[PDB]
A paper describes a structure:
The sigma-1 receptor (σ1R) is an endoplasmic reticulum (ER)-localized, non-opioid transmembrane receptor implicated in many pathological conditions, including neurodegenerative disorders and cancer. So far, all reported σ1R structures are homotrimers, with the ligand binding site located inside the β-barrel domain of each σ1R monomer. The ligand binding site is located in the lumen of the β-barrel domain (β1-β10), whose opening is covered by two membrane-adjacent helices (α4/α5) at the carboxy-terminus. Here, we present crystal structures of σ1R from Xenopus laevis (xlσ1R) bound to two endogenous neurosteroid ligands, progesterone (a putative antagonist) and dehydroepiandrosterone sulfate (DHEAS) (a putative agonist), at 2.15-3.09  Å resolutions.
Recently, we determined another xlσ1R-DHEAS complex structure to 3.09  Å in a C2 form (termed xlσ1RDHEAS-C2). The xlσ1RDHEAS-C2 structure contains six protomers (two trimers) in an asymmetric unit. Interestingly, DHEAS seems to show three different binding poses in xlσ1RDHEAS-C2: Pose-1 for protomers A and D, Pose-2 for protomers B, E and F (also for xlσ1RDHEAS-I432), and Pose-3 for protomer C. The three DHEAS poses differ mainly in that the C3 sulfuric ester group assumes different conformations.
Residue numbers in the entry:
A (entry chain B): -5 to 219
B (entry chain C): -5 to 26, 31 to 219
C (entry chain A): -5 to 220
Write the structure that this text describes.
């Protein structure tokens, strides 16, 4: 009959249900009970980006990098280490220039030159994007309506929150993420693995992340030494 | 590399396809009751398509609970769950789901689009608000559909779908529903990594199955 | 503490770094050391497509196919083997009609009837797209600005270059690719494997590829004694 298939389907769905729920619980436990020392704060970066949001996004990029190096020496990558690397994730495609990255924090310049959009990702990390140019449409979970954000505004992707993001052509922003940063890595690379097959972009991403970790360790050792 | 592996892949898949095709034809003959029908849901959604999509959602849910008691989820079980599939991202609120049928409210608040999916199920979407661009397979031109229209995604058919921001519709599917699950979750597995959304999806599906089983037992018992 | 986790994360990142570098190096080695026999040249297809770029894209398709069969008989698929096959790749969705395909070259008609865009793919193959209708937005790697291309233009995706592509509704073009063609197959099918699950489209893709390869082998063997 069909009630047998219904029972079997419900049991298989229960298996998937428990597996996914325990994976979510493991994510919550690893994030929640993780290390929490912070070099930056979201409003510092927010004000720094909003202050320069009236300029051309490239002049703003340069001045923001200079100010970050001035106020946090030893935590921002050198000019020789700055690079624009494509980022394909959740169905959207942008590009990044990473300035700081540790085990618990990261700072970068993000944006796209094409109309793009997709899933924001869900992870134990609070993300904040202060727009320098363009538009940022955010569609929160559980609602049927979205909101537009413009230069000067700061969108906060909360911990455990999932949204839909959409960016118009030429949208550029300064992004600061705080939490358990490695848990985001998966989401950052899935489309690179199962969609673009761009192993050179994966190479660039892991290389800049390892360089940022090396810089953080070097600064820590020089300050204890 | 060698083309031989491609030849084996193409020749091997043709054999599996031919066997699967013969199995499908035997099932079509094997075929010869449904709670809904695509024309009922289509007319019900087209009737309320002139109102605001939220009022339309509410009135359609009320009418479905009135005309089909025991087959629609309670208000406590209704939930908007994201749906990432075929490269597009929308959201759903499931009202009914069994082994052979499902009813839901679908739509997106952002401009999105991608692959429609291919599965053994006849899908019908009656638009309440927005626009729906459909690009059928094998053709070089697409068509736009507006509120009141009803797009029928035929069994085994694959199209390209595109929805503008704020597009909302009522959807009814009939066939072998589990065969769609794969397409429903692929982007959740290999793209978004949103395991909480996967949890919500399988949870509402299991709740709908449990409600259907409870109604069946109460009607036999 | 946290320095242990930082060290473990850095070691894993270095592992991914060397593995990805070895994958890129294998791709470069398979590309550089491959066949050089070419039936066409990108400038031939580019001029042939630009000449017909003022007509309707369907009439342009027909006339370009006729001219390709005229100037290279036995290397273009028959009308019975022509078919529009969906292409989901890098996050975008279009459709193709393959006319010629070997280990080192391929020719097809590509385009989309919906607004789409995504990753162009990275592989050892030089691609050229001459636009018949629509618009083609290209965003190169390392830059923060994109460029629009219109009918008559020819975008050249160089070897090892990665871009972002975007096509407006009704965009159609003639495409010629030269290099290590199999390395693109992965990129061509990834979204079909890990997103759409459309195995019938996978069948159509491998079918048209195998038929083009069989046509090439049959022409070479029949032109020889066998
Ligand atoms: C993947 C993610 C997280 C959130 C952003 O999504 S967004 O919608 O909130 O803007 C995209 C984004 C951009 C770059 C990604 C970042 C997560 C952390 C990553 C992997 C590093 O350490 C190096 C590069 C970083
Ligand atoms: C698999 C399918 C089919 C309808 C949608 O197809 S679509 O073309 O309108 O996007 C996508 C989709 C999303 C979620 C799926 C639904 C089918 C019925 C499902 C499995 C339940 O009972 C719980 C969640 C439901
Ligand atoms: C994967 C790619 C390469 C790039 C094309 O256009 S592009 O703008 O993305 O560069 C799209 C595309 C479509 C079909 C693909 C083609 C590459 C060569 C392929 C794999 C064959 O031998 C048979 C089908 C062909």
């Amino acid at each position: 009959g069909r009630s047998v298939d219904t029972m079997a389907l419900w049991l298989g769905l229960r298996a998937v249900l428990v597996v996914a729920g325990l994976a979510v619980l493991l994510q919550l436990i690893r994030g929640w009970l993780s290390s929490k020392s912070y070099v930056f704060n979201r409003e510092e970066i927010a004000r720094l980006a909003k202050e320069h949001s009236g300029l051309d996004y490239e002049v703003a990029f340069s001045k923001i990098i200079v100010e970050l190096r001035k106020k946090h020496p030893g935590h921002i990558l050198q000019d020789e280490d700055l690079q624009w690397v494509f980022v394909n994730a959740g169905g959207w495609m942008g590009s990044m220039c990473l300035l700081h990255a540790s085990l618990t924090e990261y700072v970068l310049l993000f944006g796209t030159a094409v109309d793009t959009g997709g899933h924001s990702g869900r992870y134990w990390a609070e993300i904040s994007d202060t727009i320098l140019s363009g538009t940022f449409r955010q569609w929160k979970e559980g609602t049927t309506k979205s909101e537009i954000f413009y230069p000067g505004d700061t969108i906060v992707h909360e911990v455990g929150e999932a949204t839909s993001v959409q960016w118009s052509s030429g949208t550029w922003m300064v992004e600061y993420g705080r939490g358990f940063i490695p848990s985001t890595l998966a989401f950052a690379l899935a489309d690179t693995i199962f969609s673009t097959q761009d192993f050179l972009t994966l190479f660039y991403t892991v290389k800049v992340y390892s360089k940022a970790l090396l810089l953080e360790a070097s600064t820590h050792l020089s300050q204890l030494g």
